[PDB]
Amino acid sequence: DLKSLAKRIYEAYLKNFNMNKVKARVILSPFVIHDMETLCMAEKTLVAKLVNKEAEVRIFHCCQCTSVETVTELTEFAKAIPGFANLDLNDQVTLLKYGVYEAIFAMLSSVMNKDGMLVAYGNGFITREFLKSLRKPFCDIMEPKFDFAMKFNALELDDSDISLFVAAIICCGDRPGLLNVGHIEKMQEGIVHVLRLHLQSNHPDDIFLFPKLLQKMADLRQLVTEHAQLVQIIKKTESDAALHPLLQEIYRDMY
Numbered sequence: 001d002l003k004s005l006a007k008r009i010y011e012a013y014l015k016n017f018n019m020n021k022v023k024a025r026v027i028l029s030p031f032v033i034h035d036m037e038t039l040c041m042a043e044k045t046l047v048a049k050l051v052n053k054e055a056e057v058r059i060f061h062c063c064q065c066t067s068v069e070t071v072t073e074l075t076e077f078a079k080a081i082p083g084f085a086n087l088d089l090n091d092q093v094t095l096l097k098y099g100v101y102e103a104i105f106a107m108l109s110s111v112m113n114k115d116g117m118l119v120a121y122g123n124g125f126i127t128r129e130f131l132k133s134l135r136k137p138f139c140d141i142m143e144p145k146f147d148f149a150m151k152f153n154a155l156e157l158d159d160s161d162i163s164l165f166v167a168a169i170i171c172c173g174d175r176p177g178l179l180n181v182g183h184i185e186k187m188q189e190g191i192v193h194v195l196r197l198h199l200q201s202n203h204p205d206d207i208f209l210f211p212k213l214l215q216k217m218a219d220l221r222q223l224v225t226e227h228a229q230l231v232q233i234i235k236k237t238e239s240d241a242a243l244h245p246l247l248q249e250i251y252r253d254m255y
């Protein structure tokens with residue numbers, strides 16, 4: 001009843017996300033981008049988009065491409081959440097608008113380790129060092145995300161846990177401008193119930209796992225606000241680039 005919903009959500013997650021934590025950890029052992037030199041050759045194989053321009057922009061263009069891919073996937077996933085489809089159109093869109101970036105960063109942790117992160121479906125590996133060497137303000141984009149990932153990854157969740165977490169992020173009753181707050185809260189109530197009990201079953205060796213995750217939720221909301229603004233800065237300060245149209249609509253006057 002509760003069990004089943006966890007199965008249905010986990011399977012939806014498995015069908016709809018190209019990257020998951022089992023597949024990432026397996027990979028994490030091909031091509032390393034660690035300096036401007038190795039970056040260029042990376043751009044002779046991996047990235048088929050910009051295919052000069054300032055290195056900082058090339059990098060984060062490639063990053064926004066993946067954001068958009070994930071927004072697509074999160075939409076597919078959400079449709080498979082029992083009940084989601086039945087929400088008002090405008091609500092489904094508002095939930096995803098305010099939800100996707102929080103969920104993006106949650107799942108990004110899966111491909112990050114203390115050295116760097118998998119990129120482009122796990123065929124690239126850009127070092128944390130390298131990113132930290134990019135000119136301001138670009139060297140300050142990914143650092144807070146690695147910070148979050150190291151704390152998240154310490155909880156040692158698996159995909160079954162993550163799938164329910166991501167569902168709970170999306171189905172959140174307090175996003176600004178919802179119509180049927182009542183119904184979304186009822187949905188949230190159900191999922192969060194399943195999540196807490198699931199964590200207790202799956203990880204009986206950690207009493208406080210569920211509360212730890214609620215704290216991570218708080219962390220991600222702050223992480224997203226900070227990201228929105230640093231994005232805002234870069235839009236004003238740098239025009240050599242341009243933000244993807246779809247991301248422009250998501251970022252718009254939210255936080």
Ligand SMILES: O=C(O)[C@H](Cc1ccccc1)Oc1ccc(-c2cccc3ccccc23)cc1
Pocket residue numbers: 057060061063064065066067068104108141231232234235236238241242243247
């Ligand atoms: O939001 C995102 O998609 C990423 C963060 C992320 C990283 C890795 C995986 C998932 C998400 O942040 C971005 C940061 C910077 C730019 C960007 C690039 C070039 C020109 C720009 C001009 C103005 C504003 C922003 C510009 C795009 C996305």
